[PDB]
């Protein structure tokens, strides 16, 4: 299972005249590459970004992409002309193309396309296809594209051979960053619940990598099932933030603790108690005039 590699492209067209394309690349949840409309060349976001390609290999790929981007922009503009009444600006296009790692050596590749935020087409095998629920209009365009066997051949090369190759490289190359562990820091807080006379307690965990974490409120050894985990949120420094809130009758707070498990902890879970010496002091430093 493990790692999945995505190259994401977003293309926006406003009118005949105006357009831009930007792309970002991810391995796992770490961003390895950046391309932006105004930049001629792709930019590494990690030291290990070139993976195991030679300057030569890299630049060749870069070349293919550079050419593709400009061609694609025009190619779309034509499609609209062909489309006529059926489609009109503004148009938004997203492509997700990635190779997904399987235990060495094995992988699955994908190329997916979204139009106006909906997933419509994918490249499968040798050719493009509309997915289920796609608008019937696209079929001509798929046909017109599928004719270009040269493009098709090249895309099979990228998907079939190149991605898994490049990525297996990335994995050796960037191993250190990939496998890093950063410890979380937790702090408590409270807010008054919608329920009258009730309090909402919040356990904050911030700064961890890798992503998987466990958070629960407990009273003694018994988990409180009233806990709702929030979504994971990005920290800017490649770390994760998350919080768990439980609601309780005012005064029920004493005896509770927020408990966190993480890979970086190893054995030592963080048990943080409401009304702890630290909670009290830490709380003091947060005060404010709502």
């Amino acid at each position, epitope marked *: 299972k493990n790692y999945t590699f995505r190259c994401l492209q977003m293309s926006s067209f406003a009118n005949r005249s105006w357009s831009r394309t930007d792309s970002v690349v991810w391995l796992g949840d770490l961003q390895t590459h950046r391309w932006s409309n105004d930049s001629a060349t792709i930019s590494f976001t990690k030291p290990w970004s070139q993976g195991k390609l030679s300057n030569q290999q890299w630049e060749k790929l870069q070349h293919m992409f550079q050419v593709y981007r400009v061609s694609f922009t025009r*190619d779309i503009q034509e499609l609209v002309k062909m489309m006529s009444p059926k489609e009109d600006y503004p148009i938004e296009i997203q492509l997700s193309a990635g190779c997904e790692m399987y235990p060495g050596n094995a992988s699955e590749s994908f190329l997916h396309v979204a139009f106006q935020g909906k997933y419509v087409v994918r490249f499968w095998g040798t050719s493009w296809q509309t997915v289920p629920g796609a608008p019937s209009w696209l079929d001509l365009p798929i046909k*017109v594209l599928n*004719a270009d066997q040269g493009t098709s051949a090249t895309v099979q090369m990228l998907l079939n051979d190149t991605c898994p190759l490049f990525v297996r490289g990335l994995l050796e190359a960037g191993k250190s960053d990939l496998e890093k562990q950063e410890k979380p820091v937790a702090w408590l807080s409270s807010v008054p619940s919608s329920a009258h006379g009730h309090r909402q307690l919040v356990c904050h965990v911030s700064g961890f990598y890798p992503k998987p974490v466990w958070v629960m409120w407990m009273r003694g050894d018994q988990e409180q099932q009233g806990t709702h985990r929030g979504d994971f949120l990005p920290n800017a420094d490649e770390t994760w933030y998350l919080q768990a809130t439980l609601d309780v009758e005012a005064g029920e707070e004493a005896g509770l603790a927020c408990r966190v498990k993480h890979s970086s902890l190893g054995g030592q879970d963080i048990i943080l108690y409401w009304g702890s010496l630290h909670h009290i002091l830490d709380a003091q430093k947060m005060v404010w005039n709502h």
Partner: T-cell receptor
Amino acid sequence: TQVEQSPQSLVVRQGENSVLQCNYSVTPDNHLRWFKQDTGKGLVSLTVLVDQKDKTSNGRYSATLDKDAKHSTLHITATLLDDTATYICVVGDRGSALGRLHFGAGTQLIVIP
Amino acid sequence: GGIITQTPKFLIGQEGQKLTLKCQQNFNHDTMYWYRQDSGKGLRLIYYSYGAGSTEKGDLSEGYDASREKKSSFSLTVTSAQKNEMAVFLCASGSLLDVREVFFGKGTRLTVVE
């Protein structure tokens, strides 16, 4: 300007073999193809080349392409009098019907008896 | 299995006149073009179409207009003729599914006389 052919004009003696040239700058370059236009007339397709290194022949007509060199040549073998009419090198930038064709000025061939 | 035929073969005009020419294509081709030949320069697109009625301007569009009335017919109109002008105009038609199938008309030759 993006497609170049020389010589501007070529003279050959009947039965001889003549060679014509196209060099080009367009990108992408899906294909290159050659046309013959008789004066007072339209274009007739001679040969079409798709591959990175390719060769094709249509009858007494032969062409080669080197995509790496962005260069092509057309061969006429045992040239006849009918072969005088201008010869045009065209490059297509897409492999789908969305593409555009880039046209050279042409080379005029005069065949002498 | 077709011809693509431009009419007229030969055209006479007066400065400031408006001249309209037609292209007839039977190959079932969706795409159609109008090109100009200027001696020693090579063909330049004026107008193109994906069907009827549609028209996308060629890099030589201004000064001309074109109408696609139907699948099989494409017309080009020269809004005002230019004195002493001589020109050649060419109709080509294309396949959506094969970029390489393109066919050309025999051309229309225009002489403007004051």
